[PDB]
Structure 1
Amino acid sequence: NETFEKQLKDLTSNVKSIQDNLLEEIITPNTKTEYLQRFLIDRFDKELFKKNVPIVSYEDIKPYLDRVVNGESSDVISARTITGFLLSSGTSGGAQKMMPWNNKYLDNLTFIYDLRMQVITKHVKGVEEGKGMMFLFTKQESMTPSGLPARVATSSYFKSDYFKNRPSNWYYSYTSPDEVILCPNNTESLYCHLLCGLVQRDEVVRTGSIFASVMVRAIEVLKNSWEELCSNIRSGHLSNWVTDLGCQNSVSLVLGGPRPELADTIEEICNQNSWKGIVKRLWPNTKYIETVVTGSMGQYVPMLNYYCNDLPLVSTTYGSSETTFGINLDPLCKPEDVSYTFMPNMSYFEFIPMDGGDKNDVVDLEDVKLGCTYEPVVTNFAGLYRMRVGDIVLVTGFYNNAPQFKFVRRENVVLSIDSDKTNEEDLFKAVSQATSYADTSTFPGHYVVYLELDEEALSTCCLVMEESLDNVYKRCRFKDGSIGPLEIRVKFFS
């Protein structure tokens, strides 16, 4: 508390000096990299940096990134060794962007985890002796020619000691064994998350996932699997179809032995007329749902409130493959009122105005204007200098001297159900090969493109349209099952 109260007041009061000091911390060891040498940055000088280092897009610097991805020394862009890459949900030329990465990403990520934990406990009581049923997933890595792995942000965390050796307190205590969280087969691991959460239902004081789409999926899978889950509880055995050795061993220990009475109890709850409030009925000690409900995830809020009996939905964190940005300092607000306060120790932040309210070319964090929209620009600890993020944010206020931002949209994105972010360009290519709407009225959600009939021909249209989308889409569609068959309404399905 005392340490935290002071910590937060300082971070948010001293933004100007923290940002300027951070930029010096980044630039000084990097003055001899090929990249900074190119732009004649031979010492820390903020004015020369702003004047001479260009504001770049991913495509602008891809030739440097490709070199590091292929095995060239990371000193071309960063004197802090690059030890891996992050796979962005954002795409470049149909291929997922690969951002450079090192353990500073995890230093900052864990800093934010500890900070948001304190923010939550300040405002929410009755959580410190319980566990969380957190639907957390690991995604198998992709190998690059350099031999370094490329992972999604949270997988870079789970597959590290930052997670394995995390703090032993309520916030880091889950109903699922680590083996379940680490399991790269997410169909198996989601089933196991639910089973373990049910067995330990009285201990659950929070539940959630990174994004709302995954929370909704977990509930939908519960609705479709409860009979089987209860049979495992009754018998004290995990279903044979789960092949992961880690899950088998760890979940067997959670089960312990036959629990016919607990099975009866759960079955009676699931057999009611309606699924309304099911989360709070199965997990009666839950204090809040922890999941992002901003941006494209806002579409899931009505379903969440239905299943959770208006438990608070707490949307804590805004982050990307470039850097974690910051957190929600008013966690108990309504989803539509969520703003994120950037933390000035994360990266050096600049902002390009996206409307007429601010006529500058680019501005520092401390200079953004209320009610104006911007694209964030990031200088980080892994070789990105003044990189455009492609998101649009709106200044809603200032907490002490720290600007607070509403997430508006990812620029150019037209369709999003889960982690997929299909942009106008991808959709143009698809309809060529052949308007739209993201339908989440049913699960899973699915794309809907408005365009007797040759049903073979129009079913092939749906097909070639999907085949032209990106790898994130195809993973959600064919592997996760988080996205259903694309639908063309002239109705035909892929």
Structure 2
Amino acid sequence: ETFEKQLKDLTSNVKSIQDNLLEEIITPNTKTEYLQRFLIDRFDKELFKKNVPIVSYEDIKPYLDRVVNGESSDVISARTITGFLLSSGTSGGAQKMMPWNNKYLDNLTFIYDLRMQVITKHVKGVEEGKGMMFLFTKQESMTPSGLPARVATSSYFKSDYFKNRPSNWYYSYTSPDEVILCPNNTESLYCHLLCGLVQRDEVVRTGSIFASVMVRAIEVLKNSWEELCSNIRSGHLSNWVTDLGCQNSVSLVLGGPRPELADTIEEICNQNSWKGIVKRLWPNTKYIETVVTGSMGQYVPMLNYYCNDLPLVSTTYGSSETTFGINLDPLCKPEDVSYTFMPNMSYFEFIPMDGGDKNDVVDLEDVKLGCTYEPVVTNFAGLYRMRVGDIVLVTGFYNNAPQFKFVRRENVVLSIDSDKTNEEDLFKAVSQTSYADTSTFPGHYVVYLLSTCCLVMEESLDNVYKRCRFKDGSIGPLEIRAKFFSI
């Protein structure tokens, strides 16, 4: 009842909520160095639109550099910046750093609570069980200001928003918090699988942020099940896991020897065909929760094979600048997913990317059906009218809330995992066509046109690629097709 009214109000009063949010954001910031220079003396929406420039990351980086280096955040935000977000996008090989504060986590947990209600409205049999969720923490980078830079979900996991989260099915995992918080993701993924297998009847959902990570978890399971079952049989975690938090918390989950359970799992895994394996090991699973839009659509056939066509539920579209919104038709096919922007997240504007809309920039409530746009974001952490670099397509409207298909990220040419290699990067590499191969796991780049040539191309790519390729092992060695490989 409360949720039904909440969602009706959010998607019906879009214009009013957006206009009030802009006033809410701008009013305490009119005296910042940044907004004072565009002479926004008081809050006035037409003055904001006329005087405040639409900017790229590059335009405002001088201001962000000052905050990163320790200058008072009030140069851009009266809401103190207490950390930064590392974006998967880069500017000159360097990851972009976005300003961040707890309003990011206020919005994120608002969206978690909303999509939880959307899921349970449409999917039965989930509220009495737990999620086997392959969630990972990545260690933070220090900035000269002394504030940490983290990836979006790590900024949540390492906060009390996560530690002191609510107590219901949607925030209940088969993995202890220590496993989720473990910065060694090889150890934590193994422990995720171990705890999920031990509590296999309680699993009602499984997944990860992106479909690539869900696929990797299944491949690790395929390559680790004999060892996992030996830990279940003995009641002892393998010695190689060094994280103390994992050792202590997983030992409690194991409890003692489980040779009968081990036998049961070994009998399932021992089939030559891995088709439907997820459903056979976790028979109470109701759905797979993972993003399957954008470059992640390449993994849908693999996921359907392993999960025996359990629904793939792609819930959220977000970025280091802001969370955008959620999928209000969770049980649709992957190719049909659209995201309804939520008007309380940030003030959204849109630049037309085709001839169907001839305006220079338009408000959320004015976007035209069937037209493409680049989103523009004004947020609660010092970003004013910043271009996001994504292209979206207006597919419809839920009440008065536009729904958007994610089309692509501008200039990105190659993407396997979190990496987003764009045309400039592939250019430097070749000067020092392409295809993203996923038919084998791990996926890898393919540069059509020598062992050394493969290496120097990889060495010129960005840090996200190199962390995925050499550390997580989510990308294989780059291949120049005679066929040659990096190493």
TM-score by length of 2: 0.99
Write the deviation string for residues 61-108 of structure 1: whole angstroms up to 9, x where unpaired. 000000000000000000000000000000011100000000000000
SS at match of 1:263: helix
Residues in 2 aligned to 1:231 and 1:152: alpha-carbon distance in whole angstroms? 34
Residues in 1 aligned to 2:207 and 2:27: alpha-carbon distance in whole angstroms? 41
| 1:182 Cα deviation from its structure 2 partner | 0.1
Residues in 1 aligned to 2:194 and 2:441: alpha-carbon distance in whole angstroms? 21
Residues in 2 aligned to 1:172 and 1:82: alpha-carbon distance in whole angstroms? 27
| 1:9 Cα deviation from its structure 2 partner | 0.2
Write the deviation string for residues 437-485 of structure 1: whole angstroms up to 9, x where unpaired. 00000110000100xxxxxxx0110000000000000000010000000
Write the deviation string for residues 255-276 of structure 1: whole angstroms up to 9, x where unpaired. 0000000000000000012000
Write the deviation string for residues 287-319 of structure 1: whole angstroms up to 9, x where unpaired. 000000000000000000000000000000000
Q: Does 1:272 align with 2:267?
A: no
Residue correspondence of structure 1 range 52-71 to structure 2 within 5 A: 52-71=51-70
Residue correspondence of structure 1 range 145-294 to structure 2 within 5 A: 145-294=144-293
Write the deviation string for residues 399-435 of structure 1: whole angstroms up to 9, x where unpaired. 00000000000000000000000000000000000x0
Residues in 1 aligned to 2:257 and 2:409: alpha-carbon distance in whole angstroms? 49
| 1:121 Cα deviation from its structure 2 partner | 0.3
Residues in 2 aligned to 1:109 and 1:463: alpha-carbon distance in whole angstroms? 39
Residues in 2 aligned to 1:290 and 1:371: alpha-carbon distance in whole angstroms? 28
Residues in 2 aligned to 1:38 and 1:243: alpha-carbon distance in whole angstroms? 53
SS at match of 1:417: coil
Residues in 2 aligned to 1:54 and 1:213: alpha-carbon distance in whole angstroms? 37
Residue correspondence of structure 1 range 70-149 to structure 2 within 5 A: 70-149=69-148
Q: Larger deviation: 484-493 or 175-184? A: 484-493
Residues in 1 aligned to 2:439 and 2:275: alpha-carbon distance in whole angstroms? 16
Residues in 2 aligned to 1:483 and 1:245: alpha-carbon distance in whole angstroms? 29
Structure 1: tracts of 5 or more residues without a match: 451-457
Residues in 2 aligned to 1:217 and 1:41: alpha-carbon distance in whole angstroms? 50
Write the deviation string for residues 30-82 of structure 1: whole angstroms up to 9, x where unpaired. 00000000100111111111111000000000000000000000000000000
SS at match of 1:233: helix
1:418 maps to which residue? 417
Residues in 2 aligned to 1:409 and 1:247: alpha-carbon distance in whole angstroms? 38
| 1:355 Cα deviation from its structure 2 partner | 0.5
Residue number among 464, 467, 483 corresponding to 1:491 in the alignment: 483
SS at match of 2:442: coil
Residues in 1 aligned to 2:159 and 2:408: alpha-carbon distance in whole angstroms? 31
SS at match of 2:470: helix
SS at match of 1:225: helix
SS at match of 1:480: coil
Residues in 2 aligned to 1:358 and 1:186: alpha-carbon distance in whole angstroms? 45
Residues in 1 aligned to 2:128 and 2:199: alpha-carbon distance in whole angstroms? 13
Write the deviation string for residues 226-278 of structure 1: whole angstroms up to 9, x where unpaired. 00000000000000000000000000000000000000000000001200000
SS at match of 2:239: coil
Residues in 2 aligned to 1:215 and 1:246: alpha-carbon distance in whole angstroms? 23
1:436 maps to which residue? 434
Write the deviation string for residues 18-38 of structure 1: whole angstroms up to 9, x where unpaired. 000000000000000000001
Residues in 2 aligned to 1:161 and 1:42: alpha-carbon distance in whole angstroms? 37
1:453 maps to which residue? none
SS at match of 1:325: strand
Q: Measured at CA, do residues 56 and 490 of structure 1 come closer, stay the same or move farther in structure 2, by a change above 3 Å?
A: farther
Residues in 2 aligned to 1:490 and 1:75: alpha-carbon distance in whole angstroms? 58
Write the deviation string for residues 166-212 of structure 1: whole angstroms up to 9, x where unpaired. 00000000000000000000000000000000000000000000000
Q: Measured at CA, do residues 490 and 370 of structure 1 come closer, stay the same or move farther in structure 2, by a change above 3 Å?
A: farther
1:373 maps to which residue? 372
Moved over 2 A (4+): none
Write the deviation string for residues 346-368 of structure 1: whole angstroms up to 9, x where unpaired. 00000000011100100000000
SS at match of 2:355: coil
TM-score by length of 1: 0.98
SS at match of 2:348: strand
Residues in 2 aligned to 1:338 and 1:114: alpha-carbon distance in whole angstroms? 20
Residues in 1 aligned to 2:238 and 2:478: alpha-carbon distance in whole angstroms? 32
| 1:490 Cα deviation from its structure 2 partner | 5.2
Aligned Cα RMSD in Å? 0.4
SS at match of 1:42: coil
SS at match of 2:471: helix
Residue correspondence of structure 1 range 440-459 to structure 2 within 5 A: 440-450=438-448, 458-459=450-451
Write the deviation string for residues 376-405 of structure 1: whole angstroms up to 9, x where unpaired. 000000000000000000000000000000
Residues in 1 aligned to 2:119 and 2:287: alpha-carbon distance in whole angstroms? 10
1:345 maps to which residue? 344
Q: Measured at CA, do residues 493 and 3 of structure 1 come closer, stay the same or move farther in structure 2, by a change above 3 Å?
A: same
Residues in 2 aligned to 1:262 and 1:66: alpha-carbon distance in whole angstroms? 55
Residues in 2 aligned to 1:270 and 1:444: alpha-carbon distance in whole angstroms? 21
Residues in 2 aligned to 1:272 and 1:473: alpha-carbon distance in whole angstroms? 35
| 1:131 Cα deviation from its structure 2 partner | 0.3
Residues in 1 aligned to 2:430 and 2:47: alpha-carbon distance in whole angstroms? 46
Residues in 2 aligned to 1:442 and 1:279: alpha-carbon distance in whole angstroms? 19
Residues in 2 aligned to 1:237 and 1:275: alpha-carbon distance in whole angstroms? 27
Residues in 2 aligned to 1:273 and 1:155: alpha-carbon distance in whole angstroms? 37
How many residue pairs get aligned? The number is 485
Residues in 1 aligned to 2:325 and 2:41: alpha-carbon distance in whole angstroms? 30
Residues in 2 aligned to 1:442 and 1:165: alpha-carbon distance in whole angstroms? 40
1:454 maps to which residue? none
SS at match of 2:84: strand
Structure 2: tracts of 5 or more residues without a match: none
Residues in 1 aligned to 2:327 and 2:382: alpha-carbon distance in whole angstroms? 27
Residues in 2 aligned to 1:95 and 1:335: alpha-carbon distance in whole angstroms? 32
Residues in 2 aligned to 1:440 and 1:245: alpha-carbon distance in whole angstroms? 35
Residues in 1 aligned to 2:222 and 2:369: alpha-carbon distance in whole angstroms? 44
| 1:113 Cα deviation from its structure 2 partner | 0.1
